[PDB]
From a paper:
TsdA comprises two cytochrome c-like domains connected by a long unstructured linker.
However, for TsdA co-crystallized with tetrathionate, the electron density in the active site could be confidently fitted, and this is the TsdA structure presented here. The presented structure was determined to 1.3 Å resolution from crystals grown at pH 4.6. In this structure, Cys123 is present as a cysteine S-sulfane conjugate rather than the cysteine S-thiosulfonate adduct expected from reaction with tetrathionate. The heme iron of the N-terminal domain heme is coordinated by the sulfane atom of the Cys123-S-sulfane conjugate and by His80. The active site of TsdA co-crystallized with tetrathionate contains density that is well interpreted as a molecule of thiosulfate at 46% occupancy. The presence of thiosulfate in the crystallization environment is expected because it is formed as a product of the initial thiosulfonation of Cys123 by tetrathionate (Reaction 6). The thiosulfate molecule has bonding interactions with the amino acid side chains of Arg109, Arg119, and Ser127 as well as with the main chain amide group of Gly221 from the electron transfer domain. The thiosulfate molecule in the crystal structure plausibly occupies the position of the thiosulfate molecule in the first half-reaction because only a small movement of the thiosulfate would be needed to achieve the geometry expected in the disulfide bond-forming transition state: the attacking sulfur atom (thiosulfate sulfane atom) in line with the bond between the target sulfur atom (heme-ligating sulfur atom) and the leaving group (the heme iron).
Numbering used by the authors:
A (entry chain A), B (entry chain A): 31 to 265
Write the structure that this text describes.
Amino acid sequence: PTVALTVPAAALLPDGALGESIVRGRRYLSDTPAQLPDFVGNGLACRHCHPGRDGEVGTEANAAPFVGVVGRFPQYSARHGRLITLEQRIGDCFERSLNGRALALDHPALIDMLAYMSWLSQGVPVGAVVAGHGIPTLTLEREPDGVHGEALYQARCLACHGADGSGTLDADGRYLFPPLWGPRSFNTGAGMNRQATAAGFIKHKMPLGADDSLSDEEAWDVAGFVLTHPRPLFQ
Amino acid sequence: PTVALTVPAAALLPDGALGESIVRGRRYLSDTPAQLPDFVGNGLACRHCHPGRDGEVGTEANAAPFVGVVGRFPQYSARHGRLITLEQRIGDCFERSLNGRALALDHPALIDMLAYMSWLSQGVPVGAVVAGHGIPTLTLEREPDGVHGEALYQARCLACHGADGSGTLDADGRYLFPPLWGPRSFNTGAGMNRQATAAGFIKHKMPLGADDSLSDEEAWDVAGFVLTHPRPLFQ
Ligand code: HEC
Ligand code: HEC
Ligand code: HEC
Ligand code: HEC
């Protein structure tokens, strides 16, 4: 079954221990390098690929929302060759997207992330599919043209992500516009390093506030440009 | 929200890796000492306190069904003094009810238990309360009378659980009727060692196939008798 993407009201947060956990979980997801420096090896927070409005994280259709995610695990992973839990999946995002180290599976910060994801999933039937889950891929027949992609990047992306892909810092030292390549970006093991996933994300979410504005060809070619560049190597 | 206790159809099991996991999970829950001997320190399987029909485990109202349990975690534990995950909760049942050792939080058998619980929870909204969850307690004002309880035990329980509480083995060496005290029963750390929980279980589920037949006084007193006896000590 597919159900709608619903976002709960932060005014109806439970109190007690669970509410305090949810609030800490939102912070870990929004501000991950500063909150979890022992585990993060780049400049990315979860929210840089799992954006949300109103200070929430992971609430946007076609940008891998967390709404409903708790009810989809455990599930099979071809990386692992077996079923994995949601804790383990978060571990892989720390190791790959954040170029870091997985939290222990009972670490309190990991549990607070889980509590926040569960809060966002409230009312979703276990096993159901949320409309707008994941990042829909975009695939062309034909190798991306990074020459075209370089021209598109300069015209549509550079002002935010920079001529050297290094992003723009905000006043408090967190990325306002995150790095797309180089030492502070996602590593080679990340899902965003796959052509069709980057092309899909770009097509649906970029340029910022212009969702679904690039033609399919343009998203494909600019993703290819972006992925020509060096970034940290995953072991 | 409270929703109904629904049990899925084993004929509609998913295939692939998830279906194979679910099936292994049902076996670990039904036949735990034989399947997980490194982790089990008594004669109990999960199904001896979380019974189910038709070979399922954890599907009976007022006998702590697993239907819906996945959507109730993480939650606060006063034992731990913080939020815990469902994997951690299962660990505590291994340590206390099964007098053993917790599985590692990524152990494949634990994940297969989780997969089975998730399958049983299919369609339950995350966060909802399933009708018949847990084991409703029964509490009297007044200390249980174990003299009364001994007479009730002889008349209503002994034929199955034995004069020495040691249970009845089946032909394949698993308990048909499980031990209520002594070295093969639950340890002192288990929830069933608490007077009001044992009284509630008994009242709602015992004698077998005579749910809600003891008066409240009778359940209370027989639970008290049962809990006068030695059993393994929890560290
Ligand atoms: C971009 C560089 C990412 C960063 C930073 C983080 N994640 Fe991610 N995540 C990313 C992709 C491309 C995907 C795949 C989407 C799909 O179609 O399924 C994911 C997925 C997840 C998931 C699974 C979601 C699902 O529906 O199954 C989770 C739980 C997840 N990501 C969590 C997560 C966390 C907690 C992060 C910070 C530690 C994180 N991700 C960063 C891309 C990126
Ligand atoms: C500023 C107004 C932006 C423009 C123009 C573009 N992007 Fe962007 N991007 C921006 C933000 C604020 C974020 C974080 C997520 C959000 O949706 O809030 C992003 C994220 C990305 C990512 C993922 C994260 C990462 O790799 O660091 C990618 C791959 C990305 N953006 C690419 C991209 C491209 C190719 C653009 C031109 C077509 C583009 N972005 C424009 C902000 C802005
Ligand atoms: C009786 C001696 C038990 C054995 C054997 C096992 N469990 Fe148990 N479990 C027992 C009690 C008395 C309770 C509390 C019920 C309540 O009202 O909440 C539990 C609870 C659980 C739970 C949590 C259920 C919930 O709704 O939150 C789980 C997940 C659980 N038990 C699992 C479990 C497993 C997997 C077992 C075998 C390893 C196991 N239990 C054995 C009593 C007994
Ligand atoms: C045989 C027909 C039984 C009679 C009579 C009684 N019990 Fe029982 N009990 C029986 C089974 C098959 C099981 C497993 C769970 C099931 O519902 O399938 C149980 C379980 C218990 C337990 C929990 C497990 C344990 O501690 O080992 C308790 C505490 C228990 N039973 C107590 C109990 C008492 C006090 C009875 C007389 C009032 C009684 N049981 C009768 C089978 C049978």
